[PDB]
Design a protein around this ligand. Structure first.
Ligand SMILES: NC(=O)C1=CN([C@@H]2O[C@H](COP(=O)(O)OP(=O)(O)OC[C@H]3O[C@@H](n4cnc5c(N)ncnc54)[C@H](OP(=O)(O)O)[C@@H]3O)[C@@H](O)[C@H]2O)C=CC1
Ligand SMILES: NC(=O)C1=CN([C@@H]2O[C@H](COP(=O)(O)OP(=O)(O)OC[C@H]3O[C@@H](n4cnc5c(N)ncnc54)[C@H](OP(=O)(O)O)[C@@H]3O)[C@@H](O)[C@H]2O)C=CC1
Ligand SMILES: O=C(c1ccccc1)N(O)CC[C@@H](c1ccc(Cl)c(Cl)c1)P(=O)(O)O
Ligand SMILES: O=C(c1ccccc1)N(O)CC[C@@H](c1ccc(Cl)c(Cl)c1)P(=O)(O)O
Ligand SMILES: [Mn+2]
Ligand SMILES: [Mn+2]
Lengths: 370, 373
């Protein structure tokens, strides 16, 4: 078989690597669609030139007019490209809750969704799950890919704990007082910030619960600054199975596209002929409260994980524009969450989620103002 | 659903641990037979009383007379017990190539063989494999238990490499010159020959051959790395560059519990890795200039047939010499290399158990001459 692949967010870090893997393996994969935001003119063209098909979407209006030929544009350009293209695999490499509609469309087409866009699942919640068949969503996120490989190591009831590794970000070891002084420069895009703030890991804890069906109190996080161990599963007998590789998104990308077949040569193996060490430390939850906050959001459930994420997108951008200090990103997430008791109802519709996100954006905006 | 277990070597370190896992899990397992040498009579008495089993083999006739009520004694006793006990699992935790006939009798009963005694597989080689059905031999060894767990991570043709971890023993990092002064006590939780085989790296050589025989993976894809914590017990690297590893604080009850109940895991068998406190897992290469045992094992394995039985028998003899104080530490493996490079004839497949025993005899006698002249 030669699987048909739509790449959403193809001008991005993940999309590009994905494109490299596909190009490297013509016999297994073919690109048949590319969606971007329009902000990276050059790349998108150099990308069309190399593919074969001009089946493409651009979000920004001013931007898509600067090119032409473009089958789809508008804020729902990405979503439309999914509905009308035929595929075996849809790779959602978009960023933010804006990936939610194409996530939802991807699932209706009955193709595999290789999910990089964790925010879609995080906001989506039970809604996105209801839209999927067992094993239709295959994670691209290196931790969740690692977990998926390690879970072949037993049966569901033999699972005791899922153990997430985290890099710790660039402020690993810093005091709360050290965090006051953090600049956009030191924390650097929205993906790098989420890492630095550990909001990313919070998102990943939520994504673990949704993907694998494991209680929040059995999802651990451990700081591993080498990022070679990508995550681990601890089983009931005391055994732990772990996945390791030098960090390289091509490995998890490859596995998600060709699941369950492994893609030969996708990435380099650990070198066990050269001395190395793998360190572990506890995450400082006093100084980095974002993870506990995500658990609290997750347990509450319903639309609350939408609120968590939406508050972040708003607070994080506001930090990037110099409008707030670094510790205020999560301070604002918490304030918003503390006031959101109403959104702990299950999202019946797409619009239930969009309402919660609107609510949270505007709540976060006001705390930025105040 | 209750599994009947014969434990060979019950009084030893593995056997004791196995009896504890069994006593902790009476719904899952039942001891139905015990075999021991006769050197630990208090222990054996206590096991008879705790398990209620009188189906016991004792190798030493005089010891069997002292304990009393022993149905099987003599060197063939353990074999006889296996042949004459209905069981679902035989746990062979004997030490050395003397485990060989019990191993073969066990496979012939059609019971699962939970193999702790790696020397009977190393020595029997293809003869043992011909007597086995797929999945019948299940590893108790911590490294191989790990590999079997990690192999669920792919399909056979997705494996690039099997990687065995080594503790490195008490002389990890030492030089060739340093090893010259090693004494029987420095080379001294396991038995005496097993601890010595760890210190000399022969154990790891044996484990390389055992990996090959158990998993049918070529020697050129079986690697070794030194990992001093012994938390990662072994790993598999896949064709896509991904590595899957199995990790736990070192404790044999884990792999024991898993071999008995394979493929079902046993709840609470051992402690899990705890990350509430900072730690590190280290890796370093092994220096073959200093510890040639492993490369030498790979060479014996590639030559095949009775060559692995020669490697092990030479060791059993040369190691015994070292403990009796008759040779220097480095000559254990020097003597194995010399016996092996002279054993051109033994590279033929054994047709019968007698081929293996002849090979062993020849290796032992040549080793003993090297200890002498
Ligand atoms: N970076 C990584 O390696 C990892 C990231 N992730 C996840 O992967 C996802 C994407 O990551 P990554 O590729 O690095 O992100 P990037 O920011 O590098 O790329 C984002 C992509 O989305 C496009 N885009 C931006 N705005 C819009 C819009 N309004 N409509 C449609 N498309 C738009 C961009 O196009 P353009 O910029 O040309 O406008 C670009 O192609 C995220 O959800 C993240 O959480 C998780 C695992 C690892
Ligand atoms: N211990 C460990 O942690 C590990 C061990 N292994 C392997 O498992 C095997 C067993 O090791 P271990 O338990 O440490 O060994 P021990 O020396 O602790 O135990 C040896 C057992 O065999 C019995 N025995 C000795 N001689 C004879 C004989 N002639 N006939 C019948 N029974 C005899 C002993 O009885 P007696 O009471 O007379 O001494 C004792 O029960 C070895 O092959 C070893 O390499 C593998 C993984 C790790
Ligand atoms: O999955 C990944 C990833 C993994 C490897 C390479 C790139 C991204 N991420 O989520 C990126 C952020 C995580 C991460 C993971 C690995 C590395 Cl090498 C880095 Cl710098 C960051 P985080 O633990 O700091 O939150
Ligand atoms: O499988 C085991 C074992 C593992 C853990 C605990 C006891 C024995 N062995 O073969 C014993 C010897 C091996 C070993 C393994 C782990 C440890 Cl903690 C030690 Cl001290 C020795 P070796 O790598 O030194 O050869
Ligand atoms: Mn990640
Ligand atoms: Mn071992």
């Amino acid at each position: 078989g030669r699987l048909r692949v739509v790449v959403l967010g193809s001008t991005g870090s993940i999309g590009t690597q994905a494109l490299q893997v596909i190009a490297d393996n013509p016999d297994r994969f073919e690109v048949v669609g590319l969606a971007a935001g329009g902000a990276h003119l050059d790349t998108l063209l150099r990308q069309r030139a190399q593919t074969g098909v001009t089946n493409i979407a651009v979000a920004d209006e001013h931007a898509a007019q600067r090119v032409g030929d473009i089958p789809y544009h508008g804020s729902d350009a990405a979503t439309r490209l999914v509905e009308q293209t035929e595929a075996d695999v849809v790779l959602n490499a978009l960023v933010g809750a804006l990936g939610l509609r194409p996530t939802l469309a991807a699932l209706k087409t009955g193709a595999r969704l290789a999910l990089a866009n964790k925010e879609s699942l995080v906001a989506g919640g039970s809604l996105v799950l209801r839209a999927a068949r067992p094993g239709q969503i295959v994670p691209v996120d290196s931790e969740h890919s690692a977990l998926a490989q390690c879970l072949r190591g037993g049966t569901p009831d033999e699972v005791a704990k899922l153990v997430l590794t985290a890099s710790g970000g660039p402020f690993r070891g810093w005091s709360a007082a050290d965090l006051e002084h953090v600049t956009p420069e030191q924390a650097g895009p929205m993906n790098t910030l989420n890492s630095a703030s550990l909001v990313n890991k919070g998102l990943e804890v939520i994504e673990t619960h949704l993907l694998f069906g494991i209680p929040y109190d059995r999802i651990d996080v451990v700081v591993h600054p080498q990022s070679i161990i990508h995550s681990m599963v601890t089983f009931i007998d005391g055994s732990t199975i772990a996945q390791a590789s030098p960090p390289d998104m091509k490995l998890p990308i490859s596995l998600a596209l060709g699941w369950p077949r492994r893609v030969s040569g996708a990435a380099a193996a650990c070198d066990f002929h050269t001395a190395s060490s793998w360190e572990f430390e506890p995450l400082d939850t006093d100084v980095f409260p974002a993870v506990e906050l995500a658990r609290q959001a997750g347990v509450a459930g319903g639309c609350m994980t939408a609120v968590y994420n939406a508050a972040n997108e708003e607070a994080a951008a506001a930090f990037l524009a110099g409008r707030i200090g670094f510790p205020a990103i999560v301070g604002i997430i918490a304030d918003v969450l503390h006031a959101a008791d109403q959104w702990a109802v299950e999202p019946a519709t797409v619009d239930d989620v969009l309402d919660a996100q609107r609510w949270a954006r505007e709540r976060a905006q006001r705390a930025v103002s105040g």
